[PDB]
Design a protein around this ligand. Structure first.
Ligand code: CL
Ligand code: NA
Length: 110
């Protein structure tokens, strides 16, 4: 299913109509029918943007993360380390480490 979810950092792709918004970063704060309300950091404004114009920003070490794909989607944690293509995440619910390919992880900015 979809990857978009609340509170993750995204970049606007070149299928969005407004050239001034293409390439900007923001954070999803709501999702309704495949439209996301994205708070754009540079322009300091919200825009309603179809999910299919977005891409997740890959998290780095010490970012909080929210799983966006697979069985653990919506679970949160902290990215402790990157080993190649895999992230090592301390999961918030049980405090245990879990290995997830980085493509499974959104950067959580609450
Ligand atoms: Cl749109
Ligand atoms: Na969409």
């Amino acid at each position: 299913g979809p990857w978009v979810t609340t509170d993750i950092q995204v970049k606007v792709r070149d299928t969005y109509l407004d050239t001034q918004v293409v390439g900007q970063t923001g954070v999803i704060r709501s999702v309704t029918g495949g439209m996301c309300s994205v708070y754009l950091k540079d322009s300091e404004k919200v825009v309603s943007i179809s999910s299919e114009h977005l891409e997740p920003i890959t998290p780095t070490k010490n970012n909080k993360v929210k799983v966006i794909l697979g069985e653990d989607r919506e679970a949160t944690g902290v990215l402790l380390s990157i080993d190649g293509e895999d992230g090592i995440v301390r999961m918030d619910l049980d405090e245990q480490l879990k290995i997830l390919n980085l493509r499974f992880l959104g950067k959580l900015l609450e």
